Amino acid sequence: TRRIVLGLIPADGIGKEVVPAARRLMENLPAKHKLKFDFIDLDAGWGTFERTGKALPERTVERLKTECNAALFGAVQSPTHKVAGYSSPIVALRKKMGLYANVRPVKSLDGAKGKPVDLVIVRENTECLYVKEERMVQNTPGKRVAEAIRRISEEASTKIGKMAFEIAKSRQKIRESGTYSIHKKPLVTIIHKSNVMSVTDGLFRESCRHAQSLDPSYASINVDEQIVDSMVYRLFREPECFDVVVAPNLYGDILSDGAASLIGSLGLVPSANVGDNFVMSEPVHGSAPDIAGRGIANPVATFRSVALMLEFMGHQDAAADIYTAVDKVLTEGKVLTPDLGGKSGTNEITDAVLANI
Amino acid sequence: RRIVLGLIPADGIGKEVVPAARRLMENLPAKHKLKFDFIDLDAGWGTFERTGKALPERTVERLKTECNAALFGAVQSPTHKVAGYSSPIVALRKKMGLYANVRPVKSLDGAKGKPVDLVIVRENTECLYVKEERMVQNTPGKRVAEAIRRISEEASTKIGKMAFEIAKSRQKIRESGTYSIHKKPLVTIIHKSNVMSVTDGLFRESCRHAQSLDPSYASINVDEQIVDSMVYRLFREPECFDVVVAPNLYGDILSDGAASLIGSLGLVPSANVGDNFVMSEPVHGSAPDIAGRGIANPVATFRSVALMLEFMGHQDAAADIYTAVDKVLTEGKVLTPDLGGKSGTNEITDAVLANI
């Protein structure tokens, strides 16, 4: 019997609707999972900034650090321009909680419209150009020159490589348990652009390759290397070729987006932010102001993110059962939200997932 | 009108597709009033193996002093750094002032899936391609490397102006009565200002200001697209893009993504454009697995020649090449292995020539 203290950070828009749905899923897990939750309600996001002048209250971070074992983030309504006193609360949370990996599974449902795909993008989420170190080096009018630093470190790159191997191993354990897969063998694909960035991407590649040596249980996992541009080209036409894909920050950002495009509705696509002592689940869709409040938001991405978080926390069984219950609802196609072409609401689809659980 | 064209087949299937393109150029309709003189030039991996230099200075000299434009085939790039070798195409672009890499992607009329008719205009001189890197810390097991990304107002303004020129040209074609999936001309500026506020801020500002540099640009619509969702939209709704202007890395990635939309890589054209020269080049490489077998697809090269002709002010000749090519492709009788058939290079050249 394990208890998880989960920080709920619904934040903005449909985040306020899908997080309550996920709370209800978690409250109703079957007894065989031996998993109970305590929830703590936390404030963050654009609304928090409008009401208080801080997107990420200090109290939110402190409560996550001192009280919580994990967290679920909804969505932020990001402004389209720079706003004084505002910085992204998700970006800040990840930094503060030490969540160096951004993990996005892209997995089509058997029988769905669309190109079959079953991959995970493992994006290093601390460095590259996202160190945000820039200077206007020449300031003569009409002739300005700006520079930015792209930083790649061995320690950060080794960590992300090691996590890619962990995920590859975890997926192979699932196949061996009897779950059907389009992959016969596990594969980690290291993404780079060494023809241009010989030193920085050279170090990224070395670090990821060397990560395989960190656990002898990784040795049998196949490893290959691919140029980012080639990956983008291949995702459109043969995305079934990829299993686990590990990438530095900018390449991983772009690849996670290209891969997610293969799924009809973004309301289906999950993610998690992972560190050594903490995991924060997060659906990939944004705050959807266009439908917020209307009771129709698709909570499937959030359910699948909670499941992914549970996989990282050593609750493989509970995660598998969430995926099975969700997949059964979608395959039957009787209770579907409007983004999937149906006429059901958030609560109704939650009810159907719960009935299968 | 006379065009003196340098022919730089270089390696592999470059030696097959450039001759095919020569034959196409020699047999253009009388009506175009276009006469070609060709100069044969040496560059590429083969050149390096024989002489120790991939790009002879003499090749550069003859381009500068004798040619109006050039057609490059493909280089067989090594898999690792080789002492004395540097990419002759990167060097030719630098030496000839070809700052703009232009990558049109256009589907066939009647193709399955979303239609596409876009042009990616990639700034091709700076960004991370300045290749200024250093291992700043060398502590064993804890190394740290850094690279500089440089964005300049002058280079960004030049590429923005080129994007508006191309948008205006495409709009003039629509107005002539040639059907287009676009009803309004649009330049979309690619950026990631949420992270690169200074460098991409300067890129965006420079591209927006470029519109002010000629009054004939004023009717072109302008918007902005974040790198975060560029590929998402490209794959799902490519029909929404007309002209796309981007800095070097973002444009490199988006151009290769867009190439995936139209089937065989043997179909995908490019041109490298400067103020005083244009060099056509297919996107495919040297294809050593098929080189010498007479099965290379010359369509990318034909379309690259047409694109070059557009920049040189020969719009009608270009239009006629595109028409002849698309007819071969849509009829679907004469197709090389990359198009699923068993026809050869010469067969598809002949079919294009028959149509034109």
Side-chain angles (χ1 to χ4, degrees), chain A residues 3-33 35 37-50 52-53 55-57 59-64 66-81 83-94 96-112 114-134 136-138 140-172 174-183 186-194 196-293 295-333 335-342 344-357, chain B residues 2-32 34 36-80 82-111 113-171 173-332 334-341 343-356:
Chain A
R3 187 163 295 261
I4 294 179
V5 180
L6 189 73
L8 301 174
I9 317 170
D12 302 311
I14 62 164
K16 306 187 189 180
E17 296 158 49
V18 297
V19 170
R23 175 178 174 145
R24 188 158 179 251
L25 170 69
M26 290 182 273
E27 291 173 325
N28 281 276
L29 291 184
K32 60 178 172 177
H33 298 160
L35 178 56
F37 296 85
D38 295 315
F39 302 100
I40 293 169
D41 302 308
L42 305 168
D43 203 9
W46 177 256
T48 316
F49 175 78
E50 286 181 315
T52 70
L56 180 57
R59 192 177 177 185
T60 295
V61 177
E62 294 164 358
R63 290 199 83 182
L64 289 169
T66 59
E67 299 177 55
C68 298
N69 300 120
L72 171 61
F73 192 92
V76 184
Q77 180 189 310
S78 300
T80 46
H81 66 294
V83 184
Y86 181 88
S87 25
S88 163
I90 337 132
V91 174
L93 274 171
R94 289 164 179 152
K96 291 159 179 302
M97 297 312 293
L99 310 180
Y100 59 84
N102 188 272
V103 177
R104 190 184 289 197
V106 181
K107 188 176 189 177
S108 56
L109 181 69
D110 179 42
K115 297 164 173 165
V117 54
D118 178 359
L119 62 76
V120 182
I121 308 299
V122 182
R123 168 187 171 195
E124 203 291 323
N125 203 17
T126 72
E127 53 179 25
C128 185
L129 289 160
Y130 300 66
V131 302
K132 292 177 174 200
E133 293 176 20
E134 305 188 281
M136 190 69 73
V137 304
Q138 289 170 50
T140 166
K143 293 178 171 285
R144 294 175 282 173
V145 180
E147 286 174 11
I149 298 291
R150 176 174 194 254
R151 187 165 299 116
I152 297 298
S153 68
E154 187 165 16
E155 286 191 291
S157 300
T158 302
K159 275 213 271 174
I160 201 69
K162 194 185 196 306
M163 182 180 300
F165 287 101
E166 278 293 305
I167 287 161
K169 175 186 180 178
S170 165
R171 292 157 65 77
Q172 188 58 28
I174 292 165
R175 297 180 191 111
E176 288 163 357
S177 83
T179 302
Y180 168 86
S181 179
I182 57 166
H183 305 302
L187 177 57
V188 169
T189 297
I190 301 156
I191 303 299
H192 65 94
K193 200 171 174 62
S194 287
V196 182
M197 298 271 69
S198 188
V199 181
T200 47
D201 283 348
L203 184 54
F204 185 79
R205 291 169 70 172
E206 292 190 50
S207 302
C208 287
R209 283 186 318 250
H210 173 67
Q212 191 175 23
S213 85
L214 294 173
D215 195 321
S217 72
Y218 303 161
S220 53
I221 300 173
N222 289 332
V223 177
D224 73 346
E225 295 173 296
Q226 282 283 297
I227 297 159
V228 57
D229 307 54
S230 302
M231 285 294 301
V232 172
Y233 180 94
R234 293 181 72 201
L235 281 173
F236 187 75
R237 59 177 55 209
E238 58 186 16
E240 74 276 6
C241 295
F242 306 102
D243 178 34
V244 179
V245 174
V246 63
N249 209 335
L250 182 68
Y251 311 155
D253 204 346
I254 295 170
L255 289 173
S256 68
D257 183 51
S261 82
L262 296 165
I263 308 303
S265 168
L266 213 52
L268 299 169
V269 185
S271 83
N273 306 276
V274 186
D276 292 320
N277 285 115
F278 209 81
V279 184
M280 182 169 74
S281 35
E282 187 188 358
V284 167
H285 58 74
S287 70
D290 49 288
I291 59 163
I296 62 173
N298 186 345
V300 168
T302 308
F303 297 164
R304 285 170 170 165
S305 303
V306 164
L308 178 68
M309 172 189 79
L310 293 173
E311 291 193 64
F312 280 102
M313 296 182 73
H315 296 278
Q316 292 87 341
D317 61 335
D321 291 341
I322 292 165
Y323 298 135
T324 301
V326 167
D327 289 358
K328 181 169 182 290
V329 176
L330 293 177
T331 301
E332 288 173 6
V335 187
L336 301 182
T337 42
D339 62 300
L340 307 180
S344 299
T346 313
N347 295 97
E348 283 73 22
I349 200 162
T350 304
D351 283 340
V353 173
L354 286 178
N356 292 350
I357 269 273
Chain B
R2 197 190 167 220
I3 292 180
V4 187
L5 191 72
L7 294 180
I8 319 173
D11 311 303
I13 66 165
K15 306 185 179 168
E16 294 160 44
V17 302
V18 170
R22 177 177 181 148
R23 283 197 66 237
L24 174 62
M25 286 178 273
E26 287 170 330
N27 293 280
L28 294 190
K31 139 184 90 180
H32 298 132
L34 183 62
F36 292 89
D37 293 315
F38 304 95
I39 293 165
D40 295 311
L41 300 161
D42 196 13
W45 181 255
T47 313
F48 170 76
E49 288 180 314
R50 289 183 269 109
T51 71
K53 195 173 181 82
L55 181 59
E57 165 74 1
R58 191 71 190 121
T59 289
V60 178
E61 293 170 353
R62 292 200 69 200
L63 291 162
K64 289 185 178 285
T65 62
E66 290 176 58
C67 298
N68 306 117
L71 168 61
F72 190 90
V75 62
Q76 184 197 290
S77 307
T79 49
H80 55 263
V82 170
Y85 176 85
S86 48
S87 170
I89 184 64
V90 171
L92 274 165
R93 294 165 173 155
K94 274 187 190 87
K95 294 168 184 291
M96 303 302 296
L98 314 177
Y99 57 88
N101 177 259
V102 180
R103 299 262 300 241
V105 178
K106 190 168 181 285
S107 53
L108 302 170
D109 183 51
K114 295 290 198 74
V116 56
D117 176 8
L118 59 82
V119 185
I120 287 148
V121 183
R122 169 188 165 203
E123 198 299 318
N124 200 26
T125 74
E126 52 179 34
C127 186
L128 285 160
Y129 298 65
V130 303
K131 293 174 164 196
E132 294 178 22
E133 303 190 277
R134 183 158 63 84
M135 192 75 74
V136 299
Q137 293 161 65
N138 291 85
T139 299
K142 310 184 183 174
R143 289 171 293 164
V144 178
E146 293 182 0
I148 299 297
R149 175 179 194 247
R150 185 165 297 115
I151 295 299
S152 70
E153 191 165 19
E154 289 188 314
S156 300
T157 301
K158 260 210 280 181
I159 202 70
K161 204 194 174 162
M162 175 66 73
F164 285 106
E165 280 289 341
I166 289 165
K168 179 201 176 176
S169 287
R170 292 157 59 79
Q171 180 64 21
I173 294 163
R174 294 186 191 107
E175 285 169 358
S176 81
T178 300
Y179 173 78
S180 167
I181 69 177
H182 306 301
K183 292 181 168 65
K184 301 205 276 220
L186 180 61
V187 169
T188 297
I189 303 166
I190 300 296
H191 70 95
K192 201 183 196 326
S193 290
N194 54 2
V195 176
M196 305 266 84
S197 65
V198 181
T199 46
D200 284 348
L202 181 61
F203 188 77
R204 295 167 61 170
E205 205 192 312
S206 300
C207 286
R208 290 199 162 263
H209 187 72
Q211 194 174 21
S212 79
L213 300 172
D214 193 288
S216 71
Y217 309 158
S219 71
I220 292 158
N221 300 283
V222 184
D223 73 348
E224 298 175 288
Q225 162 77 58
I226 67 187
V227 170
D228 300 26
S229 59
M230 67 176 199
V231 177
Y232 193 88
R233 288 191 73 215
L234 179 66
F235 283 180
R236 290 165 73 91
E237 54 186 4
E239 70 272 16
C240 295
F241 299 100
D242 179 28
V243 173
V244 182
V245 62
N248 207 345
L249 179 65
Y250 309 153
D252 196 359
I253 292 165
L254 193 69
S255 285
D256 286 315
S260 78
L261 296 174
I262 61 167
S264 173
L265 201 65
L267 269 11
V268 182
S270 85
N272 307 277
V273 185
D275 292 337
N276 300 112
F277 207 80
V278 53
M279 183 168 65
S280 40
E281 183 187 3
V283 172
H284 63 70
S286 70
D289 278 354
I290 68 158
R293 287 188 195 147
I295 59 169
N297 187 343
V299 169
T301 303
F302 297 164
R303 286 176 162 178
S304 302
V305 165
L307 177 64
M308 173 190 76
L309 291 173
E310 294 189 89
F311 281 100
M312 300 179 75
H314 294 102
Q315 295 81 359
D316 288 345
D320 284 344
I321 298 166
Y322 293 136
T323 299
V325 166
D326 284 12
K327 188 179 177 287
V328 174
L329 297 174
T330 55
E331 284 178 3
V334 180
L335 319 162
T336 41
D338 61 292
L339 303 170
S343 317
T345 314
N346 288 0
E347 285 183 292
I348 209 168
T349 308
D350 283 349
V352 173
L353 283 173
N355 285 341
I356 212 176

